[PDB]
């Protein structure tokens, strides 16, 4: 849910 996950997946 954090942005790092949402942007890199």
């Amino acid at each position, epitope marked *: *849910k*954090p*942005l*790092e*996950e*949402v*942007l890199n997946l």
Partner: antibody
Amino acid sequence: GVQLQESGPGLVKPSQSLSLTCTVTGYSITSDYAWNWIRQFPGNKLEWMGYITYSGSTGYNPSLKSRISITRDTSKNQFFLQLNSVTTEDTATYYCASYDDYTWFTYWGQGTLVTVSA
Amino acid sequence: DVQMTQTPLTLSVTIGQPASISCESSQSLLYSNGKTYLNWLLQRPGQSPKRLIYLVSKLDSGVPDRFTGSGSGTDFTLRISRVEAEDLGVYYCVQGTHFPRTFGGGTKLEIKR
């Protein structure tokens, strides 16, 4: 190098649709990062409203989900905020901002004041 | 929603003296990838917020080394080793671990003079 700029009306009538524009220069909104809308209320209280990712997915604050929409124009390098059914409680300064929370890249607009009044 | 408590409300400090702000999160901001997403913003009067610290302790480009961020779990701290005139403004912390992103009430820094 990068610059974000908010534009749109300063005065909106209650129940109408608020429509803001964030114009971006110096970077493409299709490349990377999350592109956010944040508003500050009188008293200095900040509220994250929502974002659109570089890929086009959207996240909305659950308190707004019902009446918030975020879109983009990839040819103009702009993203937009549409907030329906505005009340006087929606009077606030609206910022657009770009970040990712794990990288150095971070940029805020200068903000634009929106007054909801009759 | 995770709520963030800032202390103190305001803060009056003489130029050259230290200062620190606390931010307590209701829940652990430690995420399942070992990273903790807590940032610090400074809003100078009449200007828009600017990020100082991210990932707890990392300095943003342009930020003087006078600024130090520490903490973990629920307790976090921002330390200004030596206050200068242009440190004047309102400081916020913000968490980007739990949806939705939430901010602290802010801490106002005044210059004792």
